[PDB]
Ligand SMILES: C[C@H](Nc1cc(F)c(S(=O)(=O)Nc2cscn2)cc1Cl)c1cc(F)ccc1F
């Protein structure tokens with residue numbers, strides 16, 4: 106309700122509008138699939154077997170291209186979709202870097218802390234953004250004309266998939282999603298963060314603003330614990346991020362797939378010296 | 390009876406055509422590659438006649454990979470624009486691959502090689518489409534309405550009432566219901582190939598003499614391997630199908646020319662085979678006939 110909190114929300118909403126391509130209209134020129142080490146490979150097959158999707162592409166003319174992924178025989182076939190996913194990820198991360206760049210509170214932080222927080226949060230803000238275009242009924246991320254759909258076997262076992270169903274079930278507003286994004290972004294306990302106390306205070310103010318928004322703009326006591334439900338989802342998302350970073354690195358080690366922007370974000374081969382693309386993107 | 394009921398020359402004749410079929414028909418489509426696909430993401434009365442045929446023959450396209458995956462292309466509903474032409478480049482590439490197989494098929498048959506070069510062109514110009522349709526029917530699944538071309542599958546769009554009107558589809562459903570042997574398919578290809586009354590045939594009599602012996606051999610073959618009353622009048626049924634196919638060949642050429650006129654899609658070989666000295670204009674055909682094997 107306070108005017109600072111109103112302008113705080115309006116800044117994030119403005120940011121989200123300027124930087125989230127909801128229709129995926131500008132995502133193009135992306136790749137598609139074609140037409141001791143054993144212990145690493147065993148683990149990498151297990152990693153990919155959880156998060157399998159079919160890919161649907163609706164043409165401007167009314168046509169539909171549908172990709173169904175191969176069953177694991179035990180070879181490079183399991184990596185089929187990695188080049189496409191990397192391009193989609195990279196496209197999404199560029200959106201998140203822009204999102205952070207228009208927040209005044211973020212720009213005021215030293216560039217090393219801006220990098221550290223984006224390293225920490227990029228994945229989480231992608232997943233939060235992907236949740237807004239997720240369809241729980243059909244199990245499908247509707248990315249404009251491009252569309253990722255889960256394969257059968259149940260699915261709820263995989264922490265990342267469980268997260269998407271649970272968050273979507275909360276039926277959050279646009280304002281609540283951007284406030285989740287701000288709380289994730291401004292996390293004081295990410296590695297390499299010098300200004301711990303300032304970021305912690307900013308996080309608190311975003312949390313209070315969300316807590317106050319839910320209190321004021323929703324029925325009570327119906328949504329009595331909704332702020333805490335959101336906080337549980339952020340903690341659970343932070344856990345998934347750690348799990349994800351491990352999985353990606355294991356895969357990368359065997360089968361190099363990551364774009365240069367991803368390599369920097371996940372720590373693949375001074376803080377500004379090691380993250381030159383990210384640094385360049387934050388200056389421009 | 391078995392093959393003992395055929396003369397030595399007839400056994401030899403069938404043996405040659407079958408050997409030829411085996412050497413020149415890639416039934417799994419392993420060597421068909423580097424083809425176009427539909428891209429990812431008073432005059433007006435002509436457009437009407439083009440649209441009507443292309444509706445009936447509309448197919449979805451499936452692409453299995455050795456890795457295990459499937460790429461599936463469902464084509465667009467008629468919006469009233471260029472979208473109706475999206476599969477033509479592909480279909481033209483598949484056609485050209487099939488035609489190269491038919492040209493190779495003709496080449497290894499002795500009776501064809503001994504003809505003059507101009508007749509070889511004239512007969513292939515006359516029978517290319519026919520022999521392709523005969524080959525396509527051998528991979529046609531009637532239950533699913535799908536031509537199963539190994540890794541490629543072309544599947545008809547959604548049933549039988551609308552589709553059995555269209556002569557080319559009706560042809561495929563009818564010929565499949567006869568349940569022909571390989572030997573009967575290759576002898577149909579011979580009878581179509583050796584047609585004495587194609588345009589530009591100089592050796593009318595020698596081609597006619599050859600045709601008659603292939604028809605005689607087919608009749609004798611049927612009589613030696615078809616004892617049951619399920620296959621009554623099978624020879625005459627087959628010959629009526631070849632007459633029907635030649636009608637569909639005329640109707641097909643006239644579609645192609647109408648489409649090519651408004652939306653150019655044909656490969657240089659298709660231009661030669663459909664006309665878009667005899668040897669000089671038919672440059673690629675002449676080349677392919679000289680290359681042997
Ligand atoms: C919609 C969402 N897409 C998605 C999620 C990612 F984490 C990445 S990544 O961070 O770049 N890592 C990565 C790339 S190839 C293997 N790992 C990229 C994408 Cl496109 C998604 C979520 C899910 F639970 C199951 C399937 C999905 F497609």
Ligand SMILES: C[C@H](Nc1cc(F)c(S(=O)(=O)Nc2cscn2)cc1Cl)c1cc(F)ccc1F
Pocket residue numbers: 446448476477479480481483484485518525536543557558561645
């Ligand atoms: C399987 C077969 N495909 C096929 C048929 C053709 F006639 C030609 S063509 O002769 O080159 N001319 C042509 C090229 S683009 C339109 N016409 C090529 C192909 Cl690949 C088929 C048969 C059918 F009855 C209905 C649909 C079909 F796709």
